[PDB]
């Protein structure tokens, strides 16, 4: 087996992250007036209107860039875009018409739909246009997705590390979700610059460098891990043991979910894990130092196995097969309903309702 060329500083500004210098761009490198000048002849055609099309699109619109939306006419996204103020015929079109109008084509359809639609959209990404992704899913797993970007266009990526809903809300607050950028194909000598400028234009906080392959392996891993799948499994397991030993729902929920999200996890994020430890009792410190190695070892096998499911392509197959179905929306909502109806989340609805700021 073969190794991989490292990410290259190229003499650019860098930050030392715990022993590795990484390429990093910050908002002051791309102020609003500069972005407007840089893109003054461009049209961002944003294809798709999931939460990334929402957060990236509305941030581009607010920053004054010439952005339009392309989605299946009279589908769900179409109406969702209308209710965010995109006007059919002005800056909301069907997919083919948006691509004809745009110079930068932001493929923000579902990863499954990126594969399904690609035979039809590829002839429209002509010379002089730029093809943009927010995930390496489609072009990297070509054996399963059949997505081959044309060799005569720049192919760039900007990947916000957060929910599209928080890409929007943080930007409104003066904050911002971090983004990866990557170049998959550079034909002009400007793909990188466009990827970094795009990354700032969509409201990112800081931008750091990756590759399409690194990004898709990280992303697929994390969302299945602690970002979404792990944290939920953790909550479910801890809550169940408490309920089986007699603890009332309110007690078990406050000791599992509420204390975490309303107190301790925000301290981790504001000041780091040691600060959060030091903000709790000597008892909880002794207890937490005792048991985090036991939790690390219980989960490490699960994590190296999940990374394998990502690398070999199983998780990609799963998503292509489930989300590639026309009724994917209806059956995903079925499984979300199962989450909704678990005791722990029925209890959560009541706990949240009692918060002083919801009264």
Of Mg ion, ligand NDP, a copy of itself, none, which one does residue 126 interact with (CB within 5 to 8 Å by kind)? none
SS3 at position 254: helix
Q: Which of 33, 83, 127, 290 binds a copy of itself (CB under 8 A)?
A: 290
Cα distance between residue 131 and residue 124, in whole Å: 11
Cβ atoms of residues 64 and 40 within 8 Å: no
Site for a copy of itself in 331-350 (CB under 8 A): 332, 335-337, 339-340, 343-350
Per CB under 5 A, the segment of 73-81, 101-109, 194-202, 274-282 that binds Mg ion is 274-282
282 binds Mg ion, rule: CB under 5 A: no
Closest listed residue to residue 184, CA positions, set 219, 159, 221, 218: 159
User: What's the N-to-C CA distance of the chain in angstroms?
Assistant: 60
Q: Which of 241, 284, 302, 336 binds Mg ion (CB under 5 A)?
A: 284
Q: Is 232 a catalytic residue?
A: no
Cβ atoms of residues 121 and 95 within 8 Å: yes
Per CB under 6 A, the segment of 17-25, 97-105, 109-117, 307-315 that binds ligand NDP is 109-117
- Please say which residue, 111 or 192, places its beta carbon nearer to ligand NDP: 111
| Chain breaks of the chain after residues with C–N above 2.5 Å | none
Binding mask 163-182 for ligand NDP (x = CB under 6 A): xx------------------
Per CB under 6 A, the segment of 12-20, 74-82, 232-240, 265-273 that binds ligand NDP is 74-82
Per CB under 6 A, the segment of 35-43, 145-153, 155-163, 298-306 that binds ligand NDP is 155-163
* Cβ count within 10 A of residue 283: 8
b/e per residue, 253-273, with b = 16+ CB within 10 A? bbebbbebeeebeebeeeeee
- Please say which residue, 43 or 319, places its beta carbon nearer to a copy of itself: 319
315 binds Mg ion, rule: CB under 5 A: no
117 binds a copy of itself, rule: CB under 8 A: no
Complete edge-to-edge strand list for the sheet that includes strand 206-209: 14-17, 20-26, 206-209, 179-185, 154-160, 130-133, 104-107, 44-47, 67-70, 92-93
Query: Helices 314-323 & 282-312, crossing angle to 10 degrees?
Result: 80
219 binds Mg ion, rule: CB under 5 A: yes
Cα distance between residue 110 and residue 169, in whole Å: 21
- Please say which residue, 43 or 211, places its beta carbon nearer to Mg ion: 211
**Which residues make up the interface to Mg ion (CB under 5 A)?**
161, 219, 281, 283-284
Q: What positions carry a catalytic annotation?
A: 135
Which chain residues interact with ligand NDP by CB under 6 A? 48-53, 71-72, 75-77, 108-111, 113, 116-117, 134-135, 137, 159-160, 163-164, 280-283
């Amino acid at each position: 087996v073969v190794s991989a060329a490292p990410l290259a500083t190229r003499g650019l500004k860098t930050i030392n992250f715990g022993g590795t210098e990484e390429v990093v761009h910050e908002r002051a490198d791309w102020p609003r007036e500069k972005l407007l000048e840089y893109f003054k002849n461009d049209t961002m055609a944003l294809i798709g209107y999931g939460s990334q099309g929402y957060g990236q699109g509305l941030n581009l619109r607010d920053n004054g860039l010439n952005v339009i939306i392309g989605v299946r006419k009279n589908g769900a996204s179409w109406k969702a875009a209308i209710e965010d103020g995109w006007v059919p015929g002005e800056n909301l079109f069907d997919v083919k018409e948006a691509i004809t109008k745009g110079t930068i084509i932001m493929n923000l359809l579902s990863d499954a739909a990126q594969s399904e639609t690609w035979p039809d959209l590829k002839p429209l990404i002509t010379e002089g246009k730029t093809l943009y992704f927010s995930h390496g899913f489609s072009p990297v797993f070509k054996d399963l997705t059949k997505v081959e970007p044309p060799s005569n266009v720049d192919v760039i990526l900007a990947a916000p590390k957060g929910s599209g809903r928080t890409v929007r809300s943080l930007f409104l607050e003066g904050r911002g979700i971090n983004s990866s950028y990557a170049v998959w194909n550079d034909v002009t000598g400007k793909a990188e610059e466009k990827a970094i400028a795009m990354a700032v234009a969509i409201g990112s906080g800081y931008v750091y460098q990756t590759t399409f392959e690194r990004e898709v392996n990280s992303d697929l891993y994390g969302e299945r891990g602690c970002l979404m799948g792990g944290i939920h499994g953790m909550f479910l397991a801890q809550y169940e043991v408490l309920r089986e030993n007699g603890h009332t729902p309110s007690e078990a929920f406050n000791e599992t979910v509420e204390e975490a999200t309303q107190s301790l996890y925000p301290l981790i994020g504001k000041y780091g894990m040691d600060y959060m430890y030091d903000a709790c009792s000597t008892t909880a410190r002794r207890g937490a130092l005792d048991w985090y190695p036991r939790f690390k070892d219980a989960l490490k096998p699960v994590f190296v196995e999940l990374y394998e499911s990502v690398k070999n392509g199983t998780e990609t197959q799963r998503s292509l097969d489930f989300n590639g179905a026309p009724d994917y929306r209806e059956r995903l909502e079925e499984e979300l309903e199962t989450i909704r109806n678990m005791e722990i989340w029925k209890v959560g609805k009541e706990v949240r309702k009692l918060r002083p700021e919801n009264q």
